[PDB]
From a paper:
Biogenesis of the large ribosomal (60S) subunit involves the assembly of three rRNAs and 46 proteins, a process requiring approximately 70 ribosome biogenesis factors (RBFs) that bind and release the pre-60S at specific steps along the assembly pathway. The methyltransferase Spb1 and the K-loop GTPase Nog2 are essential RBFs that engage the rRNA A-loop during sequential steps in 60S maturation. Spb1 methylates the A-loop nucleotide G2922 and a catalytically deficient mutant strain (spb1D52A) has a severe 60S biogenesis defect. Nog2 is an essential hub enzyme that acts as a key quality control element during the nucleoplasmic maturation of 60S, anchoring both the pre- and post-rotation states of the 5S rRNP (Nog2pre and Nog2post) via extensive rRNA and RBF interactions.
Numbering used by the authors:
A (entry chain b): 1 to 299
B (entry chain b): 350 to 448
C (entry chain I): 1 to 131
D (entry chain r): 2 to 74, 85 to 96, 117 to 261
E (entry chain y): 1 to 244
F (entry chain V): 2 to 137
G (entry chain m): 184 to 472
The structure:
RNA sequence: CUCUUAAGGUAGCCAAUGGAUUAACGAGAUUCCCACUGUCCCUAUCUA
C-alpha cells in the first residue's frame, strides 16, 4: 500500500497553466526567424515551437495523472473514505478529462508538424504554428472546472492521516460529547480537539502508542446518530466505514449522566442499531464520566 | 494458518547447554562497576563527561584531546615524554627490552 | 622497461610464487587435492593434467608428458629445491629476527624438507605410471 | 499533522503579533505598487500587465452596471423549455491563385536535370477508391497529408456547426482544372453529407446531400470550414 | 542494561568499538560523543581507550579479546601497541599476532571461557589464542557462515546468532559454548549481529535503529536487567509472533 | 561521497575507467564485474569517469549465474592494480582489480569476501569491514 | 516477485538493444504506406514455419478500414521447410479469412508460380479498365518477397540475402505489360506482448548485433526437437543449453585462447542456422474441427 | 453451367539425389568475435 498521498505536484488552473506553458515555449525556444532565411530553417523553427509546446502540456498532464491515486486499486477502506470525501464519480471523470486532453494535445501536435512539412512561406508556417497553439489552448481552456476540483482534492487529500488497515487498531465510537477525543488525548499524543458541543470532530483522527513493545494505532471517529442509512450523512459515514472496514477492538463509549444531550436509552438503542457492524471484531463497552455518575447507583 | 510454523519455531526456540565437563563458568562484574552510580543527564551534581570538556574548551572538531592523560605509568611525570623511535638507522622498539 | 619484459611480467600476467608452490608440494593432502581436481569448463583440459611444480594446466596427458620430458620443467624443479626465501631470510640478512630465521631453517631441514621430497617422489612415480 | 492542522494551530496559538498591521500596510501599499509596476515593467510582461488591467476594469464596470440595474427594480412546449441548444453565394469573389502558387516543381534524376513533376501545395479531396499512379507516370502529386475527407459545416438556419464528410467537389472558382483535381480553396463549392441534419423534402424524401461553400484557407489554418447553402 | 547510540550516524557499534568486562576500546574519529556515550554507562570503573589500528577506525573488527587479554593483528604499529600497553593495566595481556586473517574481530568470537574461530586459522594462532585469552578453542561455522566474530555476539551469560541459523546448529553451538543461544536481528533487520552490537556481562550497546522487540530479545538473552532471565521468551512470544 | 559511505574520502589514484572489467571477490556467484559508471564522478569534456579503491560503481555481471546476469547493480571496489600512495609513506598496489556487489545503502549481497581488502575501502564501508576476513 | 523486488537492491535492467527495434523506423513505415497507396493488390507474405507469428494484423485492419477497394491476399512461402500436411492445414485455416496460396520461391525449381500468375491475370481482367495494376509485396523481414518476385520474373531482378533487411527501399518490376510488382522493405508492427526472444526467433534481426545469444539458446531447445538437433550437429547427451553449447563447441573446435569455448560465437551460429533453415522446425497448425 | 478451406499428430509420397542456401579462389563490397595495442582517458620522453 501507500497510506499517504501528500506527494502530488501543484495543479494549476486553466489560464495559469496556459500562461506557464506558453511563456515557457517563448523563453526556452529561440524567437528570431527571418523571411530571408531558407524555407527549411523556417519550417524547423515553427516545427520546434509546436512540438515543444505540445511536450510541455503533455508533461504537465502526466504529472497530474501519475500523482493521483487509483480509487479502484487502493484498499477498500481508503476507497470508501475517498468516495465519501471526494465523490468518486467526479474524481474519475476529472482524471479522465485530463487523460482525454493529453491525447488530444498529442494529436494536434503530430498533425500540425506533418502539415508544417509542406509550408511554402514564413507567413503560412506562422499561421500553421499559431493554429496549432490556439487549438491546444482551446483544449486546455475546456478543463477549467476539473482542474479547480483536482486542486482542491489534492490539497485536502495531502492532509489525510495514514491509517494502516492491517495493523493493530483500537477504534473509538459512540454518541457525540461522550469523551472519545478526551480518551484519545489520554492514551495517545494526538492533538484532537475537546469541546462540549456536538460534532466537534468532523474527520477521523489517529493516535499511536506501544503495548508490550508492539505498535498500536487508535482511531477516534466523529459521532454516530441513531438514524437509518438513507438519511445518514457523510460525516457519520466516515465512522460507519471505519467500523465496517477496520478489523479491530471497538470501544463504545456511554455517558450515563446525559451531559452529552442523549439519554441512556438512546445510547443503548444506538449500540443495538450498530450491533451488526462489529462482526468478527473485538467489542467492548466503556462507561465514561464516572466522576459525575456511577453505573452502580443507576435505576 | 499452517504456513508460519517453522519460521516462528526457529526463532522462538532458545537453545540450552548441557554439562560436557565439570568446569564452572561464572559471570564477572567488577566491584567498581557494581558500586557505580547511575548517570543523571539533568542533575546539578553529576560527572563532567568528555563531551562537556570538549564543549567548554573548543567544541567538536576544534578540541584537541590529550590521549597521554590516561596513561597508567610508574611516574606521572613520564606522561608527557616523547618516545624515541630512530637511532642511527635502527628501530628503538626492537631493541627495547627489560634486563 | 623494455617491451619484452614489460609484456611478460605485467601485473595482470603474473604467475604463482615459488614459496606458494613449495607449500603446495610440502603436504600430502595438498598434493592429493591438486591431483584430483573438480571438472572446470574454464580450464585447459577440464582442469585435469595439472603440473604442480610449474603450476600449469595442459590440454592433454600427452602434452603433460612432453612437458615433463623438458628442460623448462627441470628448471622449475631445480628452483624448487632449497629454502623457499620468504621475508625472514632478508630480515636475517639485514640482522633482524635471526633466531626466527634459524628456527625456520632447522624446521625446513628436519621436518618439512624430507616430507616434501617424498611427496615429490610419489608424485613423480604416479605421473610416470599413469602417463 | 492531520486534517486542518494549520487552522487548528491558528485557533490555538494565534498568528504572528504584527500580522494584521503588516497585512494592512501591504494592502495600503498596493496602489503605489500597481502604479510603479505599470510605469516600470517593460516588454512582454508590461504588455500582459496592461491587457490584464484593461480586462479587470471592464469586469468592474460590468459589475457596477449589473448592480445598478438590479437595484433599479420562442414559444417552446413544456418538455422543451428548461433546455438549451437572390441565388448569390456568400463568397461571389475570392483571391485569384496563379499556377505558380498552386504547383511546386519537383526535380528528378541523379543530377536533378528533369523538372516535369508538379506537387499541389493546397488541400485536396481525392474521393473514394483512390490509388496512386505509378511513379514513372505520376506527373501531378497530391500528398496524403494534404488530403481532406471532412469539413466543419455551419448551417445558417438553427445556428449550428457539424463535422460532415465530403462527397464531391463541384466548382473550384479558380479553374475547372482545379475542380477536376479536387483542390479545396476559399470559395470552392463542395458537396456534403447532411444525413445527421435531419432534412426532409416536402414530398417525404430524406435529404442526405447538399452544397456548401468553403469560407477559409485550409492551407493556412489546417482545417476546412464551410457554409451550407440553404 | 541495553543502550542505543551511534558512531557518527552509524549503527555499527561493533565495527567501531570493542567491549569486554574489564576495558573498552573506542575509535578516535571525530568528536567525543561516542566516548561520552560509553562513559555515561561505565563511569571510571573500567578503562576506556581511544585507539586506532593500522590507522583505521575499525577496531572492533580488527581486534579480539576478553577480560584477560587482547590480540591485535600484525598490521598494528609499534606506537599503537605501546599506546595500548600504556593505557591498559598489567592484568590485561597484549599480544600482536602474526596471522594471515588480519580481521581478528571477524574470525574470532570469544568470551571469558570459550572461543569459536575461523576453521582456516593457523595452529600457532590457535595456541596463541589459548595462551593469551585463556580459553578453549573450537573451529566452527555458524550454520555454514564463516566469520563467527561478525555473525555472533557472545558473553558469559548468553549469545545471539544470525537469524539464518538452524535449530540443530543452535543446539550444537550451545553445547559447545555452554551458554543459552537465540537467533534474531539487530539494527532493524541486520543479520550482522556481531558487528551490529557490543556486549559484556552487564552492558549492551546497539544502534539507534534497533527496535523495541529486538532490544527486549537482547536483554532477555544477555540477562542484563535485574529481572531479565532467558526464560521470558514464553512471555515475549506474543510480541515476537506479531513482530516476525 | 556516496550513500552509505562513512565519512569523507581522500583522493586515490584512479585505476578503473569505464569499460574496465574486474574480478568479483564476494560469494554471490558472479565471476567478474564490468564497470559502466562511477558514482560521484565529475563532469569534463572527453574525460572518462574512472574509479579507485573504495569507490562505488554501477556494474553488469559478464561471467556468473544467468539469473545474476543482464542487470545493473552497485559495486564497491576493494582491490586495484594501480599503485596509490598511503599517507604513512609508501606507494602500494595489488595483483588484480576486484570488487564486491552491494546495494545503494552499501550492504553486501554475499556473506564473505575472499582475498585481501584495502584499508581505505574497509574503513570507508562498515559492511565491507564486517564481511572481510583479510584487511591488507 | 518481479519488478518491485528488484529496485530495493538497486538492480536495474540493462538498456534495451537498438537492434531489436529494426523494422519499426519512420523511414520504413513511410515506404510501406507509399507502396500500399500505390498498390491495387497487396500480397501479404507469411512464413510457413510461423505464419501466425509473421502476420501484420494492424496493417490488415488499416487496409480493411481505410482502403477497402484494395485486394489483400496471403502467400504462404517456404512451404518446402514444413511437412506437406502442415502446409495443407495452414492453407485451410488461413483460407477461412483470406485467399491463401502455398508457395516455394526459387528461380529454377519453384512451386506455385503458375497459380500466382493466373491469379494476377484474373485480377488484371477484373481491372481491365485501369490500363495497369500494381501488386505490392508486404510482410515480415526475410519472409521472401524479393525471392517471390524473382521467381515470377524468372530472373534475379531483386537482391536477395539470408540476412534480414536486404531490401531497403521500394522497387518497381514489370511482370507483364499491364502488371507491375512493387518490392517493399520488411516491417515489424510495434507490440508490448512480443518480447525480444519472439522478435529474434521470427528472423527479424541480425544475430551479430545481439549481446548474449546464450540466453536465447534455450528458446532454440524448446522450439526444436532433440532428435533433429542431434542429427544436425552429430552430437548427443546434453541436459541443458550450456552443455549443448559446450559439446558443440568442443566438437567443432570453436575454442578461444586459454581453453574457454566460444559460447557467443557458437550460439550466434546456432541462431543463424535456426533462422536460415538448416535445423528443421515448425509451429503446430490449429486443431482440426 | 461450373471453379477455391478435400490432405493431419515433428517429416511424406513420387521419380544416390531432390540441388543456385554451389566447393575452391579474390590487393572486390560488408557485419561480428578472440588476440592485441598511445585509437582514446592524457599526454610525457628519446634519436636523426
Ligand atoms: N527454403 C526456402 N528458402 C527461401 C524461400 N524463399 C526465400 N528463401 C530464403 O530466405 C531468405 C530471405 O530471402 P529474401 O528474398 O531476401 O526475403 P525478404 O523478405 O525479401 O527479406 P528482406 O529483403 O531482407 O526484407 C533468402 O536467403 C532466401 O534464400 C523459400 O521459398 N524456401
Ligand atoms: K534478406
Ligand atoms: Mg470528538
Ligand atoms: Mg569528445
Ligand atoms: Mg527483399
Ligand atoms: Zn612442470
Amino acid at each position: 500500500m501507500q497510506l499517504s498521498w501528500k506527494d502530488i505536484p501543484t495543479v494549476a488552473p486553466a489560464n495559469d497553466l496556459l500562461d506557464i506553458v506558453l511563456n515557457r515555449t517563448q523563453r526556452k525556444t529561440p524567437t528570431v526567424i527571418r523571411p530571408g532565411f531558407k524555407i527549411t530553417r523556417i519550417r524547423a523553427f515553427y516545427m520546434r515551437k509546436v512540438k515543444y509546446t505540445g511536450e510541455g502540456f503533455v508533461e504537465k498532464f502526466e504529472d497530474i495523472l501519475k500523482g493521483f491515486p487509483n480509487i479502484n486499486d487502493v484498499h477498500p477502506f481508503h476507497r470508501d473514505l475517498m468516495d465519501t470525501l471526494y465523490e468518486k464519480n467526479h474524481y474519475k471523470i476529472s482524471l479522465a478529462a485530463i487523460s482525454r486532453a493529453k491525447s488530444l494535445v498529442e494529436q494536434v501536435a503530430r498533425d500540425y508538424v506533418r502539415l508544417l512539412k509542406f509550408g511554402q512561406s514564413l507567413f503560412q508556417c506562422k499561421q500553421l504554428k499559431r493554429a496549432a497553439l490556439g487549438r491546444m489552448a482551446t483544449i486546455v481552456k475546456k478543463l477549467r472546472d476539473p482542474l479547480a476540483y483536482l486542486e482542491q482534492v489534492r490539497q485536502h487529500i495531502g492532509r489525510l492521516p495514514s491509517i494502516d488497515p492491517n495493523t493493530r487498531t483500537l477504534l473509538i465510537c459512540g454518541y457525540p460529547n461522550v469523551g472519545k477525543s478526551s480518551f484519545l488525548r489520554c492514551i495517545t499524543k494526538s492533538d484532537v480537539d475537546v469541546q462540549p458541543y456536538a460534532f466537534t470532530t468532523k474527520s477521523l483522527y489517529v493516535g499511536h502508542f506501544d503495548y508490550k513493545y508492539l505498535r498500536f494505532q487508535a482511531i477516534d471517529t466523529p459521532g454516530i446518530l441513531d438514524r437509518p442509512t438513507e438519511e445518514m450523512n457523510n460525516i457519520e459515514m466516515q465512522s460507519i466505514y471505519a467500523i465496517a472496514h477496520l478489523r479491530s477492538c471497538v470501544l463504545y463509549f456511554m455517558d450515563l449522566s446525559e451531559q452529552c444531550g442523549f439519554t441512556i436509552e438512546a445510547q443503548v438503542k444506538l449500540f443495538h442499531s450498530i450491533k451488526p457492524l462489529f462482526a468478527n471484531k473485538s467489542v467492548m463497552v466503556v462507561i465514561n464520566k464516572t466522576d459525575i455518575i456511577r453505573p452502580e447507583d443507576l435505576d | 494458518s499452517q504456513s508460519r510454523i517453522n519460521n516462528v519455531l526457529n526463532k522462538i526456540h532458545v537453545a540450552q547447554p548441557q554439562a560436557r565437563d565439570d568446569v564452572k563458568r561464572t559471570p564477572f562484574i567488577p566491584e567498581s562497576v557494581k558500586n557505580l552510580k547511575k548517570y543523571d543527564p539533568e542533575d546539578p551534581n553529576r560527572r563532567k563527561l568528555a563531551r562537556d570538556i570538549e564543549a567548554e574548551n573548543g567544541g567538536a572538531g576544534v578540541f584537541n584531546v590529550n590521549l597521554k592523560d590516561k596513561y597508567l605509568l610508574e611516574d606521572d611525570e613520564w606522561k608527557n615524554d616523547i618516545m624515541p623511535e630512530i637511532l642511527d638507522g635502527k628501530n628503538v622498539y626492537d631493541f627495547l627490552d627489560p634486563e | 622497461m623494455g617491451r619484452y619484459s614489460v609484456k611478460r611480467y605485467k601485473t595482470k600476467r603474473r604467475t604463482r610464487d615459488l614459496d606458494l608452490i613449495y607449500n603446495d608440494l610440502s603436504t600430502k593432502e595438498s598434493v592429493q587435492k591438486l591431483l584430483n581436481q573438480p571438472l572446470d569448463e574454464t580450464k585447459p583440459g577440464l582442469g585435469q593434467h595439472y603440473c604442480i611444480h610449474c603450476a600449469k594446466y595442459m590440454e592433454t596427458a600427452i602434452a603433460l608428458k612432453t612437458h615433463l620430458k623438458g628442460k623448462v620443467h627441470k628448471r622449475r624443479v631445480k628452483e624448487l629445491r632449497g629454502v623457499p626465501y620468504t621475508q625472514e631470510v632478508s630480515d636475517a640478512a639485514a640482522g633482524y629476527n635471526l633466531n626466527k630465521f634459524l628456527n625456520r631453517v632447522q624446521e625446513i631441514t628436519q621436518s618439512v624438507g624430507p616430507e616434501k621430497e617424498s611427496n615429490e617422489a610419489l608424485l613423480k612415480e604416479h605421473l610416470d605410471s599413469t602417463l | 499533522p492531520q486534517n486542518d492542522y494549520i487552522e487548528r494551530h491558528i485557533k490555538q496559538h494565534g498568528k504572528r503579533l504584527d500580522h494584521e498591521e503588516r497585512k494592512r500596510k501591504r494592502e495600503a501599499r498596493e496602489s503605489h505598487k500597481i502604479s510603479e509596476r505599470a510605469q516600470k515593467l517593460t516588454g512582454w510582461k508590461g504588455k500582459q500587465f496592461a491587457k490584464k488591467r484593461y480586462a479587470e476594469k471592464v469586469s468592474m464596470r460590468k459589475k457596477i452596471k449589473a448592480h445598478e440595474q438590479s437595484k433599479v427594480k420562442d414559444a417552446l412546449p413544456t418538455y422543451l423549455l428548461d433546455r438549451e441548444q437572390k441565388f448569390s453565394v456568400p463568397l461571389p469573389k475570392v483571391r485569384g491563385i496563379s499556377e505558380e502558387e498552386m504547383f511546386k516543381v519537383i526535380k528528378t534524376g541523379k543530377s536533378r536535370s528533369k523538372s516535369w513533376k508538379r506537387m499541389i501545395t493546397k488541400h485536396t479531396f481525392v474521393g473514394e477508391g483512390f490509388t496512386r499512379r505509378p511513379v514513372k507516370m505520376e506527373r501531378i502529386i497530391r500528398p496524403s497529408a494534404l488530403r481532406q475527407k471532412k469539413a466543419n459545416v455551419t448551417h445558417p438556419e438553427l445556428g449550428v456547426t457539424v463535422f460532415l464528410p465530403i462527397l464531391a467537389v463541384k466548382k473550384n472558382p479558380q479553374s475547372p482544372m482545379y475542380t477536376q483535381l479536387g483542390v479545396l480553396t476559399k470559395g470552392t463549392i463542395i458537396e456534403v453529407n447532411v444525413s445527421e441534419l435531419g432534412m426532409v423534402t416536402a414530398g417525404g424524401k430524406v435529404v442526405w446531400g447538399k452544397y456548401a461553400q468553403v469560407t477559409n484557407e485550409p492551407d493556412r489554418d489546417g482545417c476546412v470550414n464551410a457554409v451550407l447553402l440553404v | 542494561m541495553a543502550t542505543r547510540t551511534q558512531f557518527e550516524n552509524s549503527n555499527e557499534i561493533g565495527v567501531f568499538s570493542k567491549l569486554t568486562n574489564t576495558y573498552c576500546l573506542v575509535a578516535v574519529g571525530g568528536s567525543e560523543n561516542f566516548y561520552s556515550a560509553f562513559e555515561a554507562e561505565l563511569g571510571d570503573a573500567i578503562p576506556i581507550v581511544h585507539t586506532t589500528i593500522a590507522g583505521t577506525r575499525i577496531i572492533g573488527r580488527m581486534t579480539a579479546g576478553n577480560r584477560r587479554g587482547l590480540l591485535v593483528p600484525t598490521q598494528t604499529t609499534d606506537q599503537e601497541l605501546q599506546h595500548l600497553r600504556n593505557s591498559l593495566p598489567d592484568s590485561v595481556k597484549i599480544q600482536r599476532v602474526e596471522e594471515r586473517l588480519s580481521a581478528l574481530g571477524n574470525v574470532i568470537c570469544c568470551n571469558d571461557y570459550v572461543a569459536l574461530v575461523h576453521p582456516d586459522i593457523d595452529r600457532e594462532t590457535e595456541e596463541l589464542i589459548s595462551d593469551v585469552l585463556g580459553v578453549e578453542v573450537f573451529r566452527q561455522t555458524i550454520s555454514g557462515n564463516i566469520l563467527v566474530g561478525s555473525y555472533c555476539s557472545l558473553s558469559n551469560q548468553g549469545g545471539l546468532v544470525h537469524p539464518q541459523t538452524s535449530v540443530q546448529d543452535q543446539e550444537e553451538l550451545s553445547s559447545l559454548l555452554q551458554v543459552p543461544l537465540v537467533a534474531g536481528t539487530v539494527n532493524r533487520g541486520s543479520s550482522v549481529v556481531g558487528a551490529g552490537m557490543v556486549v559484556n556481562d552487564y552492558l549492551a550497546v546497539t544502534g539507534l535503529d534497533t527496535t523495541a522487540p529486538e532490544l527486549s530479545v537482547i536483554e532477555s538473552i544477555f540477562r542484563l536487567q535485574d529481572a531479565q532471565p532467558e526464560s521470558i521468551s514464553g512471555n515475549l512470544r506474543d510480541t515476537l509472533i506479531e513482530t516476525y | 561521497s556516496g550513500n552509505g559511505a562513512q565519512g569523507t574520502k581522500f583522493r586515490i589514484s584512479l585505476g578503473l575507467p569505464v569499460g574496465a572489467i574486474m574480478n568479483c571477490a564476494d560469494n554471490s556467484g558472479a565471476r567478474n564485474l564490468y564497470i559502466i559508471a562511477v558514482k560521484g564522478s565529475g563532469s569534463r569534456l572527453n574525460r572518462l569517469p574512472a574509479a579507485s579503491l573504495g569507490d562505488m560503481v554501477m556494474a553488469t555481471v559478464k561471467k556468473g549465474k544467468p539469473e545474476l546476469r543482464k542487470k545493473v547493480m552497485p559495486a564497491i571496489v576493494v582491490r586495484q592494480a594501480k599503485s596509490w600512495r598511503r599517507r604513512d609513506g609508501v606507494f602500494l598496489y595489488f595483483e588484480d582489480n576486484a570488487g564486491v556487489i552491494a546495494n545503494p545503502k552499501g550492504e553486501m549481497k554475499g556473506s564473505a569476501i575472499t582475498g585481501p581488502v584495502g584499508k581505505e575501502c574497509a574503513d570507508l564501508w562498515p559492511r565491507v569491514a564486517s564481511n572481510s576476513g583479510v584487511v591488507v | 516477485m518481479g519488478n518491485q523486488e528488484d529496485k530495493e537492491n538497486g538492480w536495474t535492467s540493462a538498456a534495451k538493444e537498438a537492434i531489436f527495434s529494426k523494422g519499426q523506423s519512420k523511414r520504413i513505415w513511410n515506404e510501406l504506406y507509399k507502396v500500399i497507396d500505390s498498390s491495387d493488390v497487396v500480397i501479404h507474405v507469411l512464413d510457413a514455419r510461423d505464419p501466425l507469428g509473421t502476420r501484420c494484423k494492424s496493417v490488415e485492419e488499416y487496409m480493411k478500414k481505410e482502403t477497402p477497394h484494395k485486394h489483400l491476399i496471403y502467400v504462404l512461402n517456404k512451404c518446402d521447410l514444413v511437412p506437406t500436411w502442415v502446409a495443407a492445414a495452414w492453407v485451410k485455416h488461413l483460407s477461412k479469412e483470406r485467399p491463401t496460396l502455398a508457395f516455394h520461391a526459387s528461380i529454377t525449381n519453384s512451386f506455385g508460380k503458375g497459380s500466382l500468375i493466373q491469379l494476377l491475370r484474373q485480377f488484371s481482367q477484373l481491372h481491365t479498365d485501369r490500363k495497369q495494376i500494381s501488386v505490392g509485396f508486404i510482410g515480415y523481414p526475410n519472409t521472401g518477397k524479393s525471392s517471390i518476385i524473382n521467381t515470377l520474373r524468372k530472373k534475379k531482378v531483386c537482391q536477395v540475402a539470408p540476412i534480414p533487411g536486404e531490401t531497403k527501399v521500394w522497387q518497381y518490376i514489370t511482370l507483364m505489360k499491364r502488371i507491375f510488382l512493387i518490392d517493399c522493405p520488411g516491417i515489424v508492427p510495434p507490440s508490448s506482448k512480443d518480447s525480444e526472444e519472439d522478435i529474434l526467433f521470427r528472423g527479424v534481426v541480425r544475430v551479430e548485433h545481439v549481446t548474449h545469444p546464450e540466453q536465447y539458446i534455450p528458446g532454440v531447445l524448446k522450439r526444436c526437437q532433440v532428435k533433429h538437433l542431434e542429427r544436425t550437429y552429430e552430437i548427443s547427451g546434453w541436459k541443458d543449453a550450456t552443455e549443448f553449447i559446450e559439446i558443440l563447441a568442443r566438437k567443432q573446435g570453436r575454442l578461444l585462447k586459454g581453453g574457454e569455448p566460444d559460447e557467443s560465437g557458437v550460439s550466434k551460429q546456432i541462431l543463424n542456422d535456426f533462422n536460415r533453415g538448416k535445423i528443421p522446425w515448425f509451429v503446430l497448425p490449429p486443431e482440426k474441427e
